[PDB]
Amino acid sequence: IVDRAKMEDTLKRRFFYDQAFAIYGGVSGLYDFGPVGCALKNNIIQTWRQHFIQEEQILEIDCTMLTPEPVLKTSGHVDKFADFMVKDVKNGECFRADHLLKAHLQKLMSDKKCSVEKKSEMESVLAQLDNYGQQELADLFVNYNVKSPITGNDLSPPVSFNLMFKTFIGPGGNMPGYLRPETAQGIFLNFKRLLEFNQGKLPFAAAQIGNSFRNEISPRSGLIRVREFTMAEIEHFVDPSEKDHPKFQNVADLHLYLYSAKAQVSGQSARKMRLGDAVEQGVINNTVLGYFIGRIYLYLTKVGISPDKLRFRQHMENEMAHYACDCWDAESKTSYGWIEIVGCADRSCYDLSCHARATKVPLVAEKPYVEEVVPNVIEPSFGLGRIMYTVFEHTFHVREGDEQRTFFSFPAVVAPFKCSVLPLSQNQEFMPFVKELSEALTRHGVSHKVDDSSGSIGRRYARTDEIGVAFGVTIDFDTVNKTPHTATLRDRDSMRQIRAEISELPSIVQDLANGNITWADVEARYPLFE
Amino acid sequence: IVDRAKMEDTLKRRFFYDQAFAIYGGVSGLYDFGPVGCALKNNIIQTWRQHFIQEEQILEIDCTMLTPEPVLKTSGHVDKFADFMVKDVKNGECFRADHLLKAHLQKLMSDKKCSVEKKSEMESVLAQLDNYGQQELADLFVNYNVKSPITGNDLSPPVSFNLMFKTFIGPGGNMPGYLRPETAQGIFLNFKRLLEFNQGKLPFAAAQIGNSFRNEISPRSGLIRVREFTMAEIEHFVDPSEKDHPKFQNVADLHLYLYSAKAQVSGQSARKMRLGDAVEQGVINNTVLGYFIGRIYLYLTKVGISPDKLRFRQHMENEMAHYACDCWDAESKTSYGWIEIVGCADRSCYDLSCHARATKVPLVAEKPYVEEVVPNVIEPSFGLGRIMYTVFEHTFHVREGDEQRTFFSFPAVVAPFKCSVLPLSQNQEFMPFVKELSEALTRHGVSHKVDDSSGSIGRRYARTDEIGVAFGVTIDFDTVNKTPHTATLRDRDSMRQIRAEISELPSIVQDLANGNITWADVEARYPLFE
Numbered sequence A, B: 001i002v003d004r005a006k007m008e009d010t011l012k013r014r015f016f017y018d019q020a021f022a023i024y025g026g027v028s029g030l031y032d033f034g035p036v037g038c039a040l041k042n043n044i045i046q047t048w049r050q051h052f053i054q055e056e057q058i059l060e061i062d063c064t065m066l067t068p069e070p071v072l073k074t075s076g077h078v079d080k081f082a083d084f085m086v087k088d089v090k091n092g093e094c095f096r097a098d099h100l101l102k103a104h105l106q107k108l109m110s111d112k113k114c115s116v117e118k119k120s121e122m123e124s125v126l127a128q129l130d131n132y133g134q135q136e137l138a139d140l141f142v143n144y145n146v147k148s149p150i151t152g153n154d155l156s157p158p159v160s161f162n163l164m165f166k167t168f169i170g171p172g173g174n175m176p177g178y179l180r181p182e183t184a185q186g187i188f189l190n191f192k193r194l195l196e197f198n199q200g201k202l203p204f205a206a207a208q209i210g211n212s213f214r215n216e217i218s219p220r221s222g223l224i225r226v227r228e229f230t231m232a233e234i235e236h237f238v239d240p241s242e243k244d245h246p247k248f249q250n251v252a253d254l255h256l257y258l259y260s261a262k263a264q265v266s267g268q269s270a271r272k273m274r275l276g277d278a279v280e281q282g283v284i285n286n287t288v289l290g291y292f293i294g295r296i297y298l299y300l301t302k303v304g305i306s307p308d309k310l311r312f313r314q315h316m317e318n319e320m321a322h323y324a325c326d327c328w329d330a331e332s333k334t335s336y337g338w339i340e341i342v343g344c345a346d347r348s349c350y351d352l353s354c355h356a357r358a359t360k361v362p363l364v365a366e367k368p369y370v371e372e373v374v375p376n377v378i379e380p381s382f383g384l385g386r387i388m389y390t391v392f393e394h395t396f397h398v399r400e401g402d403e404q405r406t407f408f409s410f411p412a413v414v415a416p417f418k419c420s421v422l423p424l425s426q427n428q429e430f431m432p433f434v435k436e437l438s439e440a441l442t443r444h445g446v447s448h449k450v451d452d453s454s455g456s457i458g459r460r461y462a463r464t465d466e467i468g469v470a471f472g473v474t475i476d477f478d479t480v481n482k483t484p485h486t487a488t489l490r491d492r493d494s495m496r497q498i499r500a501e502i503s504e505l506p507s508i509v510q511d512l513a514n515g516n517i518t519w520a521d522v523e524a525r526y527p528l529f530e
């Protein structure tokens, strides 16, 4: 139960992100990222690269964002990629029917005058919103008589709204284009060149880390709903008859919350199963999908997401994407309820085929005389924007001190900079120490910054914790005058300190950040400091 | 004099880049980058970060690409950001007048029937093309009677063509938007928040590394002219009365080719002056601009650009950008002649003012009672796309061998991967060595890859050189059987080899790549290997 308000204030004050074109009134769905935001955003992407691209030796390509209409028409986006929109007959004001109806029912279930018999009924409606097609939503909008949230006017019937941005490539109108709503397509149009890289055998995964555009109808979720964001997508091309992953046993012992399609249609809750048992009992189709669900869980967890607030929900029969036949979304529980931050879909083979036909260009591989096959693809899609935000709410805390200080418990691999070196005097008495410590840290690969801000050592850290800095080393006079020269090591979360020689701290902070040593261990080997 | 044709073939075969939406016929100005392309593209950006952001402790932000019309209207892009376009009256076919006229004169100067008196005259015309405004170009198009390049029909008079892409943010048309043709604007709209970071003092530089869009009229220069590219821009906010840079003495002894505005209007050539002498003789206005010109020269040179093919040309009076009052472009001589790859402009203070007014939001700083001032900004703009391409032509070579093999002499800091470990047998006899070498290299921070391709050791490298791999270590039977165990170190460019213990090579390759040791030194300490 995080206090969004108080948090958003800290994220904007320290400038993690903020409204884009603020001095012009701003634009919904558009935000800019400040220094700290970029540092944290870059750490997440780098962590992702090591976790997937590096770990699975994935190929990398960087395709264009502009796309000629024909390409997206063949993919089915020009037809099925949209959201149901509604608007009051009085003025323009557009709203995403899907969500509005969801916010309306929550208002009715909240009202005490609501009977248990109804509150229950409405729950069955919400837990099946992504299914209700064109007509079905129209009925609910009439049954519950939904009306504009503000100055409640009459709402027009629900209609489709293509979420792709429109443009024109080159002078004239002969070539109408769009801004890619996803990156996947780019990888498909380059399947042959990519297939050639792996000698021609399967499986093999291609990846992309670029920006995608979504002309979202009415964004009101901060960074959760933007019309422009960076997403990392992997296209795991596997043979339809070989949907088995060799490394699955690496994540078979993971206990994570699964919310199958059945559990949703049978009105029951999500179960916390073992990834292996899940694949066994037929819950999770194959092991390829299961391996990725594990890799995903691990990544999100390693970045800072809370396990007790993370679950994988399976799509419904008619909730499926136009290009999918099965999918599982990694949802994180936030102040906006459960929201998908990573979509692991199973586009059986809808893409290579469509493009193959439309262009009469064959896109297949061969196996052992020899047979050709159309590669089935499992696509783990990461929304680096939502993942970062979820980290904010899952690590944001308010110190128990009356000063109402806040801080983020960012893991050591995502925090802006691991250590914060802050000395009392910046004269030539401490420089000999600050200098060596700063370089000793660098040799250990520990990102840091020397503090110069004004205020007491206690306030000096209050600002460091605010942006989530993992550790801190205080160099006082006793560090300079006394001998051996010892400095103070401070832990962000607990605020507890330690006193050790200023020459051993480097390797220590390195193990604390690398996860080789526990803060408990530190308090066990070295003398405590109040 | 590089053979573009042969080169483009190698760049596409190894998949550095290629036509985007190829199976759909492709689109001019749009290209995708393959694995090697991405590796090299990422090395350049990383090298840039260390050279500028890290070296000058520049602040970093990441703004949106979508921009609401009002913002670009206030910047003057909706009015002056365009290119003169012409088209034959027969069909659509659009052409950039600016260039077409330039290609026409070159055809006339090439023809032997052309007299010296005329060839000279035309040169004076080309060396002043970016000046000729609306009317002036119309005359030349009539005087030289320019006509469509293909099936030469009659060309319509030259007219302006806004290069920005058009779109609509959100449902409806109440909010018309554009795709940022540059990043600078984003940094200006966030001036206050950024100014606050530096306590409020000047100077201070903000930066951005994102994509920009340019609806280029008719792109025919491969990667030189794209409608989508990644650009790194720095906004050095300095006080108008303090246009002096403290570090200038770090690049004062640089001898680079300068092509002042005068030299262009006085029909004379470019001089190779000393950066310091240039600022003295009033050539280069201030030292702030001079420091950056040096930093730029160093970066481009460090990346792989040839000094004898690099020059800094100063803009003409009416060639100035709508937001500039003075500028210098770093031009590289390529198969397309001199092209700007880095634009270092001096937008005196045109931006902060425009936005300040239009929104009635004050954007200024203060100095020592105290006075407020409108920061003058020097904007070094890097087109990471053109810089990479220039590196291709300036490092592409054809082995003297009849097999017509090619290779790129990529510096160690940009090559896909510094070293290439290739063993003869991949059995369990060499693994103990390949393993240790691979890890020893990693501990030294040397990017590498174990070769598995088929063919003789000589052909194994022919493919490694093709993508520009700096070095290579061959592990043969003598490395396994003999003792001490020695491997062969091979230099890409010279193809010359060395024989040293397989345990010392790691540190050696590290110094060769880091530039601590010369290949000559290696041949001086260790025994040569034929």
Ligand SMILES: Nc1ncnc2c1ncn2[C@@H]1O[C@@H](COP(=O)(O)OP(=O)(O)OP(=O)(O)O)[C@H](O)[C@H]1O
Binding pocket: A214, A216, A223, A224, A225, A226, A227, A229, A231, A340, A341, A342, A343, A381, A382, A383, A384, A385, A386, A387
């Ligand atoms: N507007 C957005 N802002 C930020 N990230 C987004 C946005 N829309 C989608 N994503 C990211 O892309 C999603 C994967 O693609 P997907 O097509 O499943 O989105 P989606 O199903 O349409 O989600 P939504 O129900 O929120 O519209 C990631 O789960 C999510 O982080």
Ligand SMILES: Nc1ncnc2c1ncn2[C@@H]1O[C@@H](COP(=O)(O)OP(=O)(O)OP(=O)(O)O)[C@H](O)[C@H]1O
Binding pocket: B214, B216, B223, B224, B225, B226, B227, B229, B231, B340, B341, B342, B343, B381, B382, B383, B384, B385, B386, B387
């Ligand atoms: N179409 C393009 N493709 C790749 N890079 C580009 C393109 N257009 C501009 N750039 C990059 O941005 C330039 C800086 O901005 P600038 O406004 O000076 O471009 P420009 O003066 O319009 O150049 P041009 O004469 O080629 O149109 C860098 O010098 C160049 O690398």
